[PDB]
DNA sequence: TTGTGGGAGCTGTCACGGATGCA
DNA sequence: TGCATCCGTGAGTCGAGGGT
RNA sequence: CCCUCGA
């Protein structure tokens, strides 16, 4: 019902997701297990105008 | 019968599309087999 | 930040967010930035960028999109490879794999029920986290946090364990195996034999 | 006032989650089980939150929902096949199970012999005439219905039945090794 | 589904390499 | 940002028969 | 898999 990350690529040291998105594994832990939000997109034109 | 002359053996990541192209149906129920008839429940892990 | 400014950005928690990021991810752009950093830079930034490039350059060869690192569908191993056998006593013995898949199924279905009932976001988020954790156990138990335990506080062997160690398939069943036309017995000297 | 009800929920019931989880851990002793049971309690509690009388202590109400879902869990597990999870299924266990199964752990030799001729039976069948051997083979080796056996040998049903009963008689005579197997 | 309400264990292991994270 | 810490890896073979 | 034992 909800997508799920493969633990091989999140927690397997070195975090391949961390290297992929240039994210600290600490922050990936916060995100994936619902401790903190992440900004997925932003409308820069609307913000500017 | 396989002649057992495979050139190469290759991995990659499976896509959800690949995972569904392998599957013969979704396991929707957690029940395994009937406590009475010892038969695999429908849509379960042994369906 | 969402009450105001809400229609100016999208934010979210969890694997769905990671999936969105991977969707918006420009692999050529980041690969070029990293190549630049490793060519014209020096020091530990050079080394960390070489590390980070080993992943992106690999995802940059013959398709292989990083989207495969996030899953919407979990494959379920054939049931012969995860047997369930009746025991003397009327009790059953199941491989751990079935308990793991069963926890995944239970939590996914409970999440379906919550989504349908329009439950509070805190509760549905709890269920999504639990689903992530149960798939993490199914794939590699104990790798993050506590391992799912069976009776006697025994960690259930996941799909990763089935492959690793001197008990996994490689060392226990492929590089050596039990054979037919073979026997065993005590040895005695027998000095009358020829070499 | 539906969204008002769910907001009242997020205000009142959610801060009780820590104590409710402590209790679920007390009565399950397995943290994954306690999380499952607490989320079940929350489903069963948000389903009927109108049925709770605002103002009274909702700690005790939610605790009763918790204890009742635990009791239903115990009663439902008592009605399931009792499963013990093992890291590996033992060879002794495979064999013990095979002792009461419709097909045993068959050996390569058994399979090989079954794929080799059964000389006493093959010779007896070859003694029959062609029509009789074919009728008995189609009838009670392949199990076809009599009309189909007719349609394969393009003879009426009556004469297939004749050939069948008389080939059965002839083979019953030919097989004195029934006493060796009967 | 209403006065109350946090587990049972556990460390009595060691050497090494490298990411992680922290000031 | 330069390391210190924390984490994750590995730790012999084959046998017997009794157990969850 | 664990327990006790064998070389």
Quick summary of this structure?
Chain A has 49 residues and is an alpha+beta fold. In chain A, 47% of the residues lie in helices and 14% in strands. Chain D has helices at residues 2-12, 17-28, 31-47, 58-77, 91-98, 108-115, 119-127, 130-140, 146-153, 157-174, 178-181; one strand at 83-86.
Describe this structure as you would to a colleague:
- It is classed as transcription.
- Keywords: RNA polymerase, ECF sigma factor sigH, transcription.
- The entry is titled "Mycobacterium tuberculosis initial transcription complex comprising sigma H and 5'-OH RNA of 7 nt".
- Chains A, B, C are DNA-directed RNA polymerase subunit beta'.
- Organism of A, B, C: Mycobacterium tuberculosis H37Rv.
- The structure is cut from a larger assembly and holds three copies of chain A and one copy of chain D (182 residues).
- Chain A has 49 residues and is of the alpha+beta class.
- Helices cover 47% and strands 14% of the residues of chain A.
- Chain A contains four helices and two strands; from the N terminus they run βαααβα.
- The radius of gyration of chain A is 14 Å and the shape is elongated.
- The termini of chain A are far apart.
- The relative contact order of chain A is 0.12.
- Chain D is mostly helical and 182 residues long.
- Chain D is built from eleven helices and one strand; from the N terminus they run ααααβααααααα.
- The radius of gyration of chain D is 34 Å and the shape is elongated.
- Chains in contact: A-C, B-C, B-D, C-D.
- The A-C interface holds A 1-12, 14, 16-17, 19-22, 28, 31-34, 36-43, 46-47 and C 7-22, 24-25, 30, 51-52, 54-56, 59, 66, 68-72, 74, 108, 111-112, 115, 125-126, 128-129, 131-133, 135-136, 139-140, 143-144, 160.
- The structure holds three DNA and RNA strands.
């Amino acid at each position: 019902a909800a997508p799920v990350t493969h633990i091989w690529y999140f927690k397997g040291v070195p975090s391949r997701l961390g290297y992929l998105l240039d994210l600290a594994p600490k922050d990936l832990e916060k995100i994936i297990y619902f401790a903190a939000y992440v900004i997925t997109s932003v409308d820069e034109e609307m913000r500017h105008n | 019968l396989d002649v057992n002359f495979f050139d190469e053996l290759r991995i990659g990541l499976a896509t959800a599309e690949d995972i569904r192209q392998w599957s013969y149906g979704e396991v929707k129920k957690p029940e395994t087999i009937n406590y009475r008839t010892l038969k695999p429940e429908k849509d379960g892990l042994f369906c | 930040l969402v009450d105001r400014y809400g229609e100016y950005f999208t934010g979210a928690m969890g694997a769905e967010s990671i999936q969105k990021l991977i969707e918006n991810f420009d692999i050529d752009a980041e690969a070029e930035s990293l190549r630049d950093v490793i060519r014209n830079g020096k020091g530990q930034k050079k080394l960390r960028a070489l590390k980070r490039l080993k992943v992106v350059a690999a995802f940059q060869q013959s398709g292989n999109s990083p989207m495969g690192m996030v899953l919407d569908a979990v494959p379920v191993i054939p049931p012969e490879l995860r047997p369930m056998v009746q025991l003397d006593g009327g009790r059953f013995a199941t491989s751990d794999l079935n308990d793991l898949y069963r926890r995944v199924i239970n939590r996914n279905n409970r999440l379906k029920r919550l989504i349908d009932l329009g439950a509070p976001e805190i509760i549905v988020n709890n269920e999504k986290r639990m689903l992530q954790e149960s798939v993490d156990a199914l794939f590699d138990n104990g790798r993050r946090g506590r391992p799912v335990t069976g009776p006697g506080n025994r960690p259930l062997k996941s799909l990763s364990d089935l492959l690793k160690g001197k008990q996994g398939r490689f060392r226990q069943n492929l590089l050596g195996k039990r054979v037919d036309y073979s026997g065993r017995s005590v040895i005695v000297v027998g000095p009358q034999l020829k070499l | 006032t539906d969204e008002e009800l769910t907001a009242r929920f997020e205000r009142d019931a959610i801060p009780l989650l820590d104590q409710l989880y402590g209790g679920a851990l007390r009565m399950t002793r397995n943290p994954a089980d306690a999380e499952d049971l607490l989320q079940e309690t929350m489903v069963k509690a948000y389903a009927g939150f109108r049925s709770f009388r605002h103002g009274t202590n909702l700690k005790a109400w939610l605790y009763r929902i918790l204890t009742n879902t635990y009791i239903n869990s115990y009663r439902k597990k008592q009605r399931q096949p009792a499963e013990y999870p093992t890291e590996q299924i033992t060879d002794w266990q495979l064999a013990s199970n095979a002792e009461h199964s419709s097909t045993g752990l068959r050996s390569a030799e058994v399979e090989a012999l079954e794929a080799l001729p059964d000389t006493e039976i093959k010779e007896a069948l070859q003694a029959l005439p062609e029509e009789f051997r074919m009728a008995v083979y189609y009838a009670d080796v392949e199990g076809f219905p009599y009309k189909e056996i007719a349609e394969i040998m393009d003879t009426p049903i009556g004469t297939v039945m004749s050939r069948l009963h008389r080939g059965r008689r002839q083979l019953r005579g030919l097989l004195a090794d029934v006493a060796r197997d009967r």
